[PDB]
């Protein structure tokens, strides 16, 4: 940056705590939104997971805004840590701070959502069972899994609207994230009262990644496709498994759909 | 950037001649302009100014081509060099590059523009003659010296003449400089229709920056934080003798007259 604009930031730019966060879910396409979102001139957001409501709460509200980048009124500061949805103390936690936060999830088929989180972990583990033998307990499928339990999203929202109002909660189609992008952010932008700016011209679908990409990033003049442990190959999976776990999930699903007045199309 | 975003430049995209030109006038406000532009997701363009239609034309399309940045299908490549307006052989020369090239010029009273003109060398020259001095070829008979490059600059009508040999004036947009300055995304709108662009860049890109006086972008084309024009943009111009500045506005009244017949404008200079 310039003497000009340097200065500036240090007159009128102030950092204030998260007006709106993305709290889930894992591998529900959390980066991809907050790296679409970050294009808009209105947003400014923390680059690294904080994991502050989660892991380090214990650090203190001090701490956490300083993590917040300078910001200039009109801009709304975010941050994204996927965990958040599933973390117990999470919702009064962030209440706490102020009950007016709008909160984002970002969600996708609890079937393709799991295996994308056993994938992540065979990334980091190569020696992991298979996806099929997780799964299971027995015939009985192993709810105690953390892979299958993230997915009850049903479960995690009554938790939150213990706390929050259902209207400062946006629900995106992680599914949509991939096929129309502009769509989806669209509807985040109205929910952030965030003028449409981000639109179909913003992305460019890459052929060979097989996922859109950003024509021009917020923090460059090139193009901007996710990195290589977003998109991973998934391993086939067993159909009978596939079959099983589609039917367990299904009940939650038709009642998440209740719960936000939107069918996400898991379940056809 | 990484692996599949530079593969993806590298295998999808190509540096292509600029399809448009942003071709004047010196201290019309260029280069706001151009950083504005920036900002819409279909525009790459090249950061310093080329000068290649004016001062190396003799390396030819093919090096010229190359100092482009590489673009996806869709983006538009462009270039300012605010000398080219008034460069002889330009309309020629980029006429033979296409015919269909897009030009624009971002224009301003010829008054402060030969006041801001004179202002940059000045901070460059700081022990050349008053404006007042340079202005008059014989100042008690106010004989205006029109060979003078500050004053010459601002006869738009003439220079347009040239251009109009070569290219239609429907592939040509004038901006106007004052309108640049108190409405930009007003003015960007415009820009962007007539580039075929989506119109993306809005009011919400901008921010007045009070103590530089100017607008400013909230975000910068690549950048995450706000972004106003440097220091050599905006400067403060030196007070000119009030009877100076009324005879060349006396000077240019005709002139901007005929310019906004041929444009078909009112660029309001004149009243
Ligand atoms: O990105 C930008 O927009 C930008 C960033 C820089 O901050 C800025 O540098 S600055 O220090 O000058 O502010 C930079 O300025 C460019 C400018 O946009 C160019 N204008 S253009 O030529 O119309 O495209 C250009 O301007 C200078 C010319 O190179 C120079 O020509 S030459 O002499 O080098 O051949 C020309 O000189 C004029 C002079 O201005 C006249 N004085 S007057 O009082 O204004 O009339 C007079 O002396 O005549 C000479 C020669 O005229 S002739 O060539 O027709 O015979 O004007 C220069 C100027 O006005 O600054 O380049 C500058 C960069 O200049 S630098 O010193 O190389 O940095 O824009
Ligand atoms: N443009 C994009 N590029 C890459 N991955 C994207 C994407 N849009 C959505 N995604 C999805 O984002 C998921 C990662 O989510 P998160 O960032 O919350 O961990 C990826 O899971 P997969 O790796 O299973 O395909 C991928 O499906
Ligand atoms: N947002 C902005 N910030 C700074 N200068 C701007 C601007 N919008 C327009 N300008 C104008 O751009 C002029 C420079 O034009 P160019 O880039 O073509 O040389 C400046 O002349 P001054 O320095 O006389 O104010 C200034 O008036
Ligand atoms: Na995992
Ligand atoms: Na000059």
């Known amino acids: 940056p310039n003497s000009g604009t340097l200065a500036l930031l240090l007159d009128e730019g102030s950092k204030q705590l998260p007006q709106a966060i993305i709290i889930g879910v894992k591998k529900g396409g959390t980066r991809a939104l907050l790296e679409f979102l970050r294009v808009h001139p209105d ?82 583990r190569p020696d992991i069972p298979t996806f099929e033998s997780l799964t299971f307990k027995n015939g009985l499928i192993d709810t105690s899994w953390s892979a299958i339990q993230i997915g009850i999203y049903a479960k995690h929202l009554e938790h939150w609207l213990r706390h929050f109002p259902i209207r400062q909660m946006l629900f995106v189609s992680g599914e949509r994230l991939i096929s129309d992008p502009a769509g989806e952010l669209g509807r985040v932008q109205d929910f952030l009262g965030l003028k449409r700016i981000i639109t179909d011209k913003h992305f460019y679908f890459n052929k060979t990644k097989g996922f859109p990409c950003l024509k021009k990033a917020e923090g460059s003049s090139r193009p901007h496709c996710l990195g290589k442990t977003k998109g991973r190959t998934h391993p086939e999976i067993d159909r009978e498994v596939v079959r099983r776990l589609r039917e367990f999930y299904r009940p939650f699903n038709l009642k998440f759909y209740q719960m936000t007045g939107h069918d996400f199309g898991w379940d056809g």
């Open 43 to 124: 947003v400014r957001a923390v680059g690294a997971e904080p994991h502050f409501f989660d892991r380090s709460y214990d650090k203190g509200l001090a701490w956490y805004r300083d993590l917040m980048p300078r910001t200039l009124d009109g801009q709304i500061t975010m941050e994204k840590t996927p965990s958040y949805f599933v973390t117990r103390e999470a919702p009064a936690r962030i209440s706490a701070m102020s009950k007016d936060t709008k909160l984002i999830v970002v969600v996708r088929d609890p079937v393709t959502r799991a295996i994308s989180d056993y994938t992540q972990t065979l990334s980091k």
